[PDB]
Design a protein around this ligand. Structure first.
Ligand SMILES: Nc1cc(NCCCc2ccc(F)cc2)cc(C(F)(F)F)n1
Ligand SMILES: Nc1cc(NCCCc2ccc(F)cc2)cc(C(F)(F)F)n1
Lengths: 205, 205
């Protein structure tokens, strides 16, 4: 039947291309759906959503009808205006992120997970990463965005990284694959998982 | 003054050697202390402990008087007796870990974090990884142990890996460094962090 897949907006396009191309080798109908990382898990837990697979970075221990595995790894950076008060990016600043305003992703359910829940008390929720960085470039507050979403801005100087001393080279973020328990026995899914994983390791190095 | 450092038993010896050697370049008195990963964070939060640094894998968002950063990455494997009912290591088995008995690390406080809290309902707590693997080799139940603690047993066939399809090559586990806020301004700590991180990246590749 039709296979409904969910890819949050934190998944790099290279991951999206690999997932889409591999799925087409096995399945004959695939529905790709984009969502916010803060709304990914909340969506699959909706019975009426009938989501079969969900590629997202949000982490949750046990979800009914779904099993969790790891597909690959991506990077994420704490970014702010180049003239933000925390531009020194020292250790005292990284600890003081809880005191400044954060531009975090808002969840339709209003509740977040430990991974995506904002760190500071002053928070300004949004719906996507474009609205986030639009406010970050304005100096309103700092945020967390994937690498591919800020690589252009970093080289253009319009943004700066603040999380280099927390985790050099970026904040390694796992990309999970939540798949309905019904798929654990179908070889079609196993072929996709092994191929997508292998193609991602090749693209990783 | 004296610098008290905490390294849980999940830190590979190569990490311990690098941390110890680097600290000696800056500080003139260092007290290295070992603890269980399930007791690491609970220890630093004791005011009477006077811990200055804690190298552990246990993760906690915000801890008073302490700041969190990333030192490196290690591997961890789900292991079981080679003749365990879940020896097939397929996808249906990885999901059924919640049904079988787990040999997890017991915390002195009785409470665990999302990372270290057991997944299954049938749990048998212990105090260290030696007691864990001693029971795992007996077929009593499965457990989670670092790579260096099971590399010998895997090659000898006395143990088997079950988490290969969850995350190929092992479960990447971040190694955090919780340091007292007082150290964020002392160049001695910055030199240690940069050197230990750089020496770990060199040993990583
Ligand atoms: N909120 C959020 C969270 C992510 N994990 C990393 C969070 C851990 C963290 C937070 C603040 C720090 F100073 C240092 C580390 C990723 C993303 C992503 F990738 F979507 F941008 N967003
Ligand atoms: N309890 C515990 C937890 C660790 N994180 C990884 C847990 C995530 C997980 C659990 C069960 C699975 F089937 C697959 C993944 C590491 C360690 C270590 F490294 F100390 F052995 N222990």
């Amino acid at each position: 039947r039709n296979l409904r897949v969910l890819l949050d907006t934190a998944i790099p396009p290279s991951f999206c291309d690999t997932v889409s191309s591999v799925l087409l080798d096995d399945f004959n109908m695939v529905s790709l759906i984009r969502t916010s990382p803060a709304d990914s898990l909340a969506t699959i837990k909706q019975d009426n959503a009938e989501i079969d697979i969900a590629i997202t970075i949000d982490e949750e221990l046990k979800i009914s009808r779904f099993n969790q595995c790891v597909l690959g790894y991506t990077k994420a950076f704490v970014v702010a205006h180049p003239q933000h008060p925390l531009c020194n990016a020292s250790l005292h600043s990284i600890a003081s992120l809880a005191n400044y305003r954060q531009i975090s992703l808002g969840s339709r359910s209003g509740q977040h997970s430990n991974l995506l829940r904002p760190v500071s008390d002053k928070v300004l929720f949004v719906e996507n990463f474009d609205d986030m960085l639009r406010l970050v470039e304005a100096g309103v507050g700092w945020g967390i965005a994937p690498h591919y979403f800020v690589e252009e801005r970093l080289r253009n100087g319009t943004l700066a990284v603040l999380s280099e001393l927390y985790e050099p080279g970026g904040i390694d973020t796992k990309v999970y694959c939540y798949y309905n328990t019904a798929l654990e026995s179908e070889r079609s899914f196993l072929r996709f998982l092994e191929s997508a994983r292998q193609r991602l390791r090749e693209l990783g190095r």
